[PDB]
Ligand binder design. Structure first.
Ligand SMILES: Nc1ncnc2c1ncn2[C@@H]1O[C@H](CSCC[C@H](N)C(=O)O)[C@@H](O)[C@H]1O
Ligand SMILES: Nc1ncnc2c1ncn2[C@@H]1O[C@H](CSCC[C@H](N)C(=O)O)[C@@H](O)[C@H]1O
Ligand SMILES: Nc1ncnc2c1ncn2[C@@H]1O[C@H](CSCC[C@H](N)C(=O)O)[C@@H](O)[C@H]1O
Lengths: 148, 156
């Protein structure tokens, strides 16, 4: 069992640094970022000891296909506004290499990205306001994985 | 259950704004901030739809004691992964929350990005919650700790 975190075209340097921190906090095995729009040098200021993740672990790809090679399962994420829940994860990911895919702050994921995913995970939240900030959604999912 | 979120002396405007967003994402009942250092005007930018949360819902107090009045239970938080000594008697994990907070008004108390909660703030609390994470680096960014706890509460 190996977990790859894939972040697609992140825009906010704070979000990218916060995600890098979380990769260390929750011992995620692999970390890929597709065509980042955020300034990575600025992201490092938000990363605390996740700076090491940015510098040694993070793989930067220009295209989505190159971020999702050589895994057994791909799980995309979206809020209910735009399908499985975190409680489903343990059963699906047991003894698998799995990629968890998170989308852009402004626009989420494209049709390609969703087509290439096996499941779509939503974090239950206020139906009136179910959209979490990107890095907070990542943290919740990584916490759930750690619990397992 | 009724939940009061208490944030002690937040320093980062991004953290304060992100917390305000989470308050709306997870329908927290009461939101107190003790002596904020962050620029509240700047924080509103990170609050997305949490902006109404800051402007109207959020209560500011000068002192810790005023933020934890009139609740049944006070649950402080800390990143200390292997507590020793007397504080062990207060230590809890998230799995313990459901049983502890049933039919109660509970304050969940988070500390400063720089230095966390003081020893006396923890002494004034009933329990000390650790969120499990890498024992070599368990220290979450403040707003991410808040999001994980609020998600755990929502589940329940
Ligand atoms: N409740 C939730 N459950 C699962 N993922 C979520 C979520 N809230 C946010 N996300 C994650 O955070 C990313 C940025 S939020 C993107 C929102 C944007 N308005 C849109 O059109 O989609 C999403 O792509 C998803 O990966
Ligand atoms: N494993 C441990 N590491 C550090 N302090 C611990 C400990 N076990 C017990 N202690 C006690 O726990 C107290 C924490 S008080 C300081 C708390 C810190 N600002 C925070 O918010 O996390 C210390 O005064 C210390 O005496
Ligand atoms: N693993 C964890 N469990 C519980 N609370 C955590 C945590 N990681 C961070 N926090 C919360 O986030 C706040 C900021 S982190 C504070 C770090 C500080 N160097 C210290 O030693 O205290 C903490 O005060 C606590 O409320």
């Amino acid at each position: 069992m190996t977990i790859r975190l894939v972040i697609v075209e992140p825009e906010g340097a704070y979000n990218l640094g916060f995600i890098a921190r979380l990769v260390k906090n929750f011992l995620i095995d692999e970390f890929y970022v597709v065509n980042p729009k955020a300034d990575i040098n600025e992201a490092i200021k938000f990363s605390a000891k996740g700076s090491e993740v940015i510098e040694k672990m993070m793989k930067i790809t220009n295209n989505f296909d190159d971020a999702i090679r050589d895994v057994d399962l791909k799980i995309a994420t979206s809020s209910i506004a735009d399908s499985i829940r975190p409680i489903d994860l343990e059963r699906l990911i047991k003894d698998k290499k799995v990629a968890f895919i998170f989308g852009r702050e402004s626009v989420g994921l494209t049709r390609e990205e969703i087509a290439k995913s096996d499941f779509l995970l939503f974090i239950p939240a206020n139906p009136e306001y179910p959209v979490l900030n990107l890095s907070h959604a990542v943290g919740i999912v990584l916490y759930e994985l750690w619990r397992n």
